[PDB]
Amino acid sequence: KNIQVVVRCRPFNLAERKASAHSIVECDPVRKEVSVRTGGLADKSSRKTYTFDMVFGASTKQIDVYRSVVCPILDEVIMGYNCTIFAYGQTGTGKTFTMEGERSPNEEYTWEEDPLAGIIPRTLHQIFEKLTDNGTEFSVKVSLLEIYNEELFDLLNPSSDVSERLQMFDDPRNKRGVIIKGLEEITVHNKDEVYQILEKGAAKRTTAATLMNAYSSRSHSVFSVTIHMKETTIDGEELVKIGKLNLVDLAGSENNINQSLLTLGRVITALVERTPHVPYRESKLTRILQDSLGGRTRTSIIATISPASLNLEETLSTLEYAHRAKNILNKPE
Ligand SMILES: Nc1ncnc2c1ncn2[C@@H]1O[C@H](COP(=O)(O)OP(=O)(O)O)[C@@H](O)[C@H]1O
Numbered sequence: 042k043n044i045q046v047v048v049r050c051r052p053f054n055l056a057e058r059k060a061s062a063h064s065i066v067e068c069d070p071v072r073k074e075v076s077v078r079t080g081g082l083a084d085k086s087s088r089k090t091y092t093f094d095m096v097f098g099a100s101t102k103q104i105d106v107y108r109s110v111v112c113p114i115l116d117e118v119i120m121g122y123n124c125t126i127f128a129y130g131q132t133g134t135g136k137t138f139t140m141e142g143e144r145s146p147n148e149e150y151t152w153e154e155d156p157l158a159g160i161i162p163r164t165l166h167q168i169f170e171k172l173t174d175n176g177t178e179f180s181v182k183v184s185l186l187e188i189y190n191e192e193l194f195d196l197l198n199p200s201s202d203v204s205e206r207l208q209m210f211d212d213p214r215n216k217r218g219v220i221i222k223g224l225e226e227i228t229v230h231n232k233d234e235v236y237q238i239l240e241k242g243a244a245k246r247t248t249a250a251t252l253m254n255a256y257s258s259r260s261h262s263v264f265s266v267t268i269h270m271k272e273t274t275i276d277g278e279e280l281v282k283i284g285k286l287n288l289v290d291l292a293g294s295e296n297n298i299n300q301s302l303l304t305l306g307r308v309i310t311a312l313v314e315r316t317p318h319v320p321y322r323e324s325k326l327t328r329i330l331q332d333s334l335g336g337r338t339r340t341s342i343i344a345t346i347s348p349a350s351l352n353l354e355e356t357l358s359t360l361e362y363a364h365r366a367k368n369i370l371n372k373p374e
């Protein structure tokens with residue numbers, strides 16, 4: 042059962058406008074195609090065209106990404122499945138904008154209603170909405186694990202400082218599992234604890250950037266939500282569902298020496314080519330997210346691209362890579 046792959050294109054920034062930049066990317070949601078002009082000046086041109094599961098043009102708002110993509114995934118998490126969403130693409134294209142989002146300028150909005158909010162805040166807010174009074178006891182735990190230069194950092198632990206590296210081990214109980222020694226899990230007791238926890242992440246990320254070269258565009262971040270659910274029947278019997286969601290903001294795809302990013306590409310090649318050895322263990326990212334690539338997790342990829350012709354080759358590289366990823370078959374619960 043194929044993983045889901047969608048492609049989003051960012052809008053032009055203020056610099057590009059003043060330069061009066063023409064888009065090289067046309068998105069057609071009805072067709073679900075992305076079309077890229079690869080040459081030709083105005084009146085005759087060649088293009089490359091790709092169809093994906095969904096396609097979001099440069100005007101798409103965060104709420105549309107949320108309703109289309111994440112909403113049906115979060116329902117699946119609540120049914121006790123595991124899900125993963127990846128953001129993939131060149132630095133500058135909106136991976137962090139999508140996964141996290143931004144604050145509207147000028148304190149116009151509270152966080153829970155900011156229209157520039159991205160997947161992480163919207164998901165956490167919505168979990169408490171969906172389960173207010175339907176008869177399901179639940180708790181919500183989050184962790185934020187990042188990988189930079191094949192080392193692991195905990196971005197939510199307010200006790201350690203970002204410098205301290207974590208150790209990864211195989212999980213004896215679990216064949217396709219790893220234990221991350223020291224990784225903090227924080228309990229989010231209600232929707233009003235959400236924002237302050239995200240803020241701590243952001244502050245730790247600032248320290249990280251100071252300490253490590255090109256940190257934000259070289260480190261992979263895995264933000265996890267675990268929802269432990271319990272229902273009681275009319276007969277007083279307990280029913281248990283556990284759902285885990287990973288929101289993965291990958292290192293920028295552009296080109297250095299990212300072993301996890303190299304390994305991810307090789308894991309996808311092995312999977313789509315049906316070759317029997319898959320090199321999960323050749324990097325920390327793919328050991329951790331093993332079950333998301335051809336395993337028992339439902340999995341989406343959001344491939345972010347740029348509308349500008351300066352970014353042509355890398356936009357092509359991204360769509361090519363996203364397009365073959367479509368052939369990965371996962372086996373959810
Ligand atoms: N879909 C979008 N809508 C509006 N602005 C965007 C969008 N995508 C990216 N941006 C802007 O583009 C710049 C780079 O995006 P960012 O999330 O940092 O990308 P990345 O994490 O891929 O390097 C940021 O200034 C961001 O505000």
Ligand SMILES: CC1=C([C@@H](O)c2ccc(F)c(F)c2)[C@@H](c2cccc(O)c2)NC(=S)N1C
Binds near residue numbers: 140161
């Ligand atoms: C805390 C925060 C974001 C949030 O998604 C986030 C940011 C950094 C993290 F390490 C993190 F785990 C979550 C994300 C966000 C969160 C909540 C609302 C919103 O509009 C935007 N973008 C911004 S600017 N901030 C300040």
Ligand SMILES: [Mg+2]
Binds near residue numbers: 136137138257258
């Ligand atoms: Mg980023």
